[model samples]
Target: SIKIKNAVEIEKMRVAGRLAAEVLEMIEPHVKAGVTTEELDQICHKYITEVQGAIPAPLNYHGFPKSICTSINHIVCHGIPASEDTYFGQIQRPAVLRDGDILNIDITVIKDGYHGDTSKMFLIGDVSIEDKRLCHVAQECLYLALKQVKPGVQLGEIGTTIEKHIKTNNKNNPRFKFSIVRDYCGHGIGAEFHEEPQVVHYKNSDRTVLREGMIFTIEPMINAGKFGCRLDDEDSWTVYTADGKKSAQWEHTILVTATGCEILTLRSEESLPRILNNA
Candidate 1:
């Protein structure tokens, strides 16, 4: 069952949402070439705990040993920070960011017992055109779905809208194939990290209805290949595309308002042309 938050609870969520967005902004400059995913995780851990006086929600979540999730190209979601073993049980070095690499940083912060969650894609220096376009399209899928969120609207429309937009857009470009990761999707979030009324990104017949005071997240993970994914048996955390194609995702925590919906995790820098136009 879905929980309806009161005004006081929503206000606490607003504070948590703003701080989570600020954490993403704080780490923007450091997500460059030569940076390791573990380094970024450490930076975020310190800021969320010391500076913001909040807790990293992902840390110790169901035994997850990371402060934040860092999903590199082809990684669908829930990638552990700096794992040295692959699914094949082969020893490997930690992932390092280099020129032409793209990554997604998923952050969730808990403040005053409320949870705020969001994620964004980061492009390293001189990324490929195909990868850049994939990121742009993934974000577009998110905003288009956000436009469908309002009081009394069916939750199924959100996924239908996103799937339609992604399918129609991909139909026009025969040179490249894009798919939506159906295994993972957005979820209801507030006091708890993962709540009820799961928000699927693809078309579905779920009859859940949106109502005022309902808070959740709409995160769509788009891929450059088929809409199939594989779980890593070694870590049981990182998920990768089955076809070995690159993937991209963007997310935002939202509140269903009386009139419409409010994006609680929006950042001021998101309005800039460079950031908006690209990803």
Candidate 2:
């Protein structure tokens, strides 16, 4: 069933979303080469608890140990943060960042009973032109979907818009299937981590209508090749593509407004002009 957030709850979600965005911005520079995903996790854990005075929602949520999700190249989502000792010993030593690597950092923060979730793709140092284009197009898919958000608009239209843009722009990527992650998706978030009205990223049969006061996230994960993923047997957190192809994702927590949608997580100085089919 579809759930709509009230004004008070929406305000709380706004606060959570802004803080989540700030946390991502704070860790942006540190995501360079030579940094281990564990180090990134520690930095985020400290920032959220000490600096931001909020709880890391992913920690202990469904037995997830890490404070955040750090997915590197070929990792579709939910890449676990290796422990310090294990990171240095077993997990191939340090897991240092490398050129042509793309990392997706996912973060969710809980404050005053409300939760905010968002993620972004990071390019490590100088990456290949193909990888750069993939990042740009994934973000474009998200921007195109956000443009169509408003009251009375069918929710199915969101997926329709994104799928259309994916095919139109990703022609050169012959192997790039641009498949949407199906197991997880955008959802109504407020008071709890995952809420009602599962927002599928791919085109579906649902025709739910958008209404004011509805708060949810629009996170679309785009794959660089055929969308096939494998689970890590040990950690059971990370999901990597079977074909070893890279993937990138971007997210925004938005509120369906009377006329249009308002991205609560957007910062004026941080907002970049929307790019679409630029390549």
Candidate 3:
């Protein structure tokens, strides 16, 4: 059910991916304490629409109102930014970035009818040491998974590697054990915001073989507490940890190549090589 992209399609995806990554880069300075998530959302919305000439995939996406998904601590994923217009000129669940907060700014941009998706964790002032490691390990999970993306590799190995690494870290530090989230997972991306080949974050044996030109996202959400998640009863968009503990996540859209893979949504700040080799 996966779609292999052509050279022309791949080129467009590269452009879209660059734009998506730039949005996160541009908003980093403003994501500090005291800034409301709504303000961050608006700033990102304007940048995507006006500067980049791109369409944010989340707005009106299954009734999602925000241009970006601003998921904060204890929120597993799918947390919507409060907006005056969407809440009928009322802002419900207004979130202000505070000291010691961990926020995940998930972004997906559509350009030239193609799509690019990515997300990164932002740690506010004086984040707790546990939350810091949760974020770091979450990012490490994504990077290690990216290293396994080579042609002919079984898709399940990606999650297998992630689960193994998480377990290894948990064992190494019993008190700081983290769990791989089972609720939300990654997906194939290209012309559509979501495609086939569901990319599970936990251990699985899907048996889907990755081939050259196949593009997808590998986002792993790690919980500082239990793996359970609870959905928000009111807005129905936000998802929270059942134990109300901290969670961290990271995402990157990747393309399987002949030898290894190219991170289409790779950010400038990331130390990972854009093109990785199987060897």
lDDT of 1 by residue, 9-74 (tens): 999999999999999999999998888888999999999999999999877565788899988888
RMSD of 1: 3.7
User: After best superposition, candidate 2 residue 186: deviation in angstroms?
Assistant: 1.1
Give model 3's TM-score versus the native structure.
Answer: 0.95
Tens-digit per-residue lDDT, 1-279, candidate 2: 556888888788889988988888899879887788888999999999999999998885657888998888777788877643233112322245777789888989998888888888899989988788778888888888888887887788888888888877667566444666666678888887777778877777667888888888888888777766677676666777666778889888888877677776664344543211221
After best superposition, candidate 3 residue 263: deviation in angstroms?
0.6
- Best TM-score among the predictions, by candidate number: 3
**What would the TM-scores of all predictions be?**
0.93, 0.89, 0.95
- Candidate numbers, best TM-score first, in rank order: 3, 1, 2
> Which candidate number has the best lDDT?
3
The TM-score measured for candidate 2 stands at 0.89
Across residues 153-209, which tens digit of lDDT does each residue of candidate 3 receive?
A: 899999999999999998898978999889888999998888988999888998999
Clash number for each model: 0, 0, 0
